[PDB]
Design a binder for this molecule. Structure first.
Ligand SMILES: CC(C)COc1cc(=O)n(C)c(=O)n1C
Ligand SMILES: [Ca+2]
Ligand SMILES: [Cl-]
Ligand SMILES: [Cl-]
Length: 371
């Protein structure tokens, strides 16, 4: 079970794809909903994602159908298409997924944020870093729902530097565009969702606090945070969850005026990566780093909740720390950081001590030495 949000509000969820193309935006929306009795949200909603995850894992394609069998009807505790809780302007998070992931696999974060009063737009990237994603070739193919699928691209050694940077830059562009889409929708611009779902986008009109916008992301998505911040000042601060820094150009490190928070796992990190994080530091600017004790790279994604303790630890989905404790610490720290840097007038400043790594399960800065 993926944990419910700890905040006061019920949480809803839907999908938005506009335009229908592989250049258009595709996102999963988590939002404060009314109290309601809708069904929960299907966690991995097409067979093709499982096939893609298998390709990502490098396994026999029978593992695809195995994963599909084990996980294909599993849900996450967000109510599908429930109405938006009206009468408040909500701050907005744009969330970026890791390599091998897709939009739906960070609902633990999405839900908990939403339950504390954020609208979260989890983008699905079309840079071929997702295990799978899809789009429509033409208007008629959108109408009848005939999907065209894009699977993860595997690279040669000589392409890595070059293509990863393109991808992270395409990712940045996708975050920016999804932001403009939501802002258009907030102003009331009619938008035909290419997915034909029972959710009225006009509910979102005048519901976004237009100035209070952050970008958050895991792994490749942590790099995406930083490229995005450097490229788009509409984002006021960023939180990078166990960022893989490799995709970034050398130019970006000094070009991040916004507040930036690094939340790391214990066992993923390494000098080359931490050195790059440290290149983002400047005295005139705002930076914080913490490290969750006994955590793994997968602690930030939803698969850390998909299996038992023993199998999870075997597969490096879980660390020595409890996955609920892990994710609670990451989310609460995130909430305090957002409150400070978006100027929110909520109670999240109760977790200011987490930002500074003041918890028995946190390490201030890093455990990695770089000398
Ligand atoms: C240089 C590549 C072959 C290395 O590919 C990685 C990709 C990725 O997404 N993440 C999170 C990583 O940690 N690595 C090492
Ligand atoms: Ca720009
Ligand atoms: Cl790890
Ligand atoms: Cl290293």
């Amino acid at each position: 079970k993926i944990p419910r949000g700890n905040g006061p509000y019920s949480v809803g969820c839907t999908d938005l794809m506009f335009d229908h193309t592989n250049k258009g935006t595709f996102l999963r929306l988590y939002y404060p909903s009314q109290d309601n009795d809708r069904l929960d949200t299907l966690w991995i909603p097409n067979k093709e994602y499982f096939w893609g995850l298998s390709k990502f894992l490098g396994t026999h394609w029978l593992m695809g159908n195995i994963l599909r069998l084990l996980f294909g009807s599993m849900t996450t505790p967000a109510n599908w298409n429930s109405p938006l809780r009206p009468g408040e302007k909500y701050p907005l998070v744009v969330f970026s997924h890791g390599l091998g992931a897709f939009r739906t696999l960070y609902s633990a974060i999405g839900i908990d944020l939403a339950s504390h009063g954020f609208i979260v737009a989890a983008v699905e990237h079309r840079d071929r870093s997702a295990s799978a994603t899809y789009y429509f070739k033409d208007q008629s193919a959108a109408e009848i729902g005939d999907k065209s699928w894009l699977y993860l691209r595997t690279l040669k050694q000589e392409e890595e530097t070059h293509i990863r940077n393109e991808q992270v830059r395409q990712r940045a562009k996708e975050c920016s565009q999804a932001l403009s889409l939501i802002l258009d929708i907030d102003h009331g611009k009619p938008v035909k969702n290419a997915l034909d779902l029972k959710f009225d986008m006009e509910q979102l009109k005048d519901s976004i606090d237009r100035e209070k916008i952050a970008v958050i992301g895991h792994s490749f998505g942590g790099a995406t945070v930083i490229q995005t911040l450097s490229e788009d000042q509409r984002f006021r601060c960023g939180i990078a969850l166990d960022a893989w820094m490799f995709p970034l150009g050398d130019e970006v490190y000094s070009r991040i005026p916004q507040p930036l928070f690094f939340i790391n796992s214990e066992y993923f990190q390494y000098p080359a990566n931490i050195i790059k994080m440290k290149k983002c530091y400047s005295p005139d600017k705002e930076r914080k780093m913490i490290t969750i004790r006994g955590s793994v790279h997968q602690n930030f994604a939803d698969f850390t909740f998909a299996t038992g303790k023993i199998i999870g630890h075997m597969l490096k989905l879980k660390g020595d720390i409890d996955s609920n404790v892990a994710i609670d610490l990451s989310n609460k720290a995130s909430l305090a950081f957002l409150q400070k840097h978006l100027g929110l007038h909520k109670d999240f400043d109760q977790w200011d001590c987490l930002i500074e790594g003041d918890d028995e399960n946190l390490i201030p800065g890093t455990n990695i030495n770089t000398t």
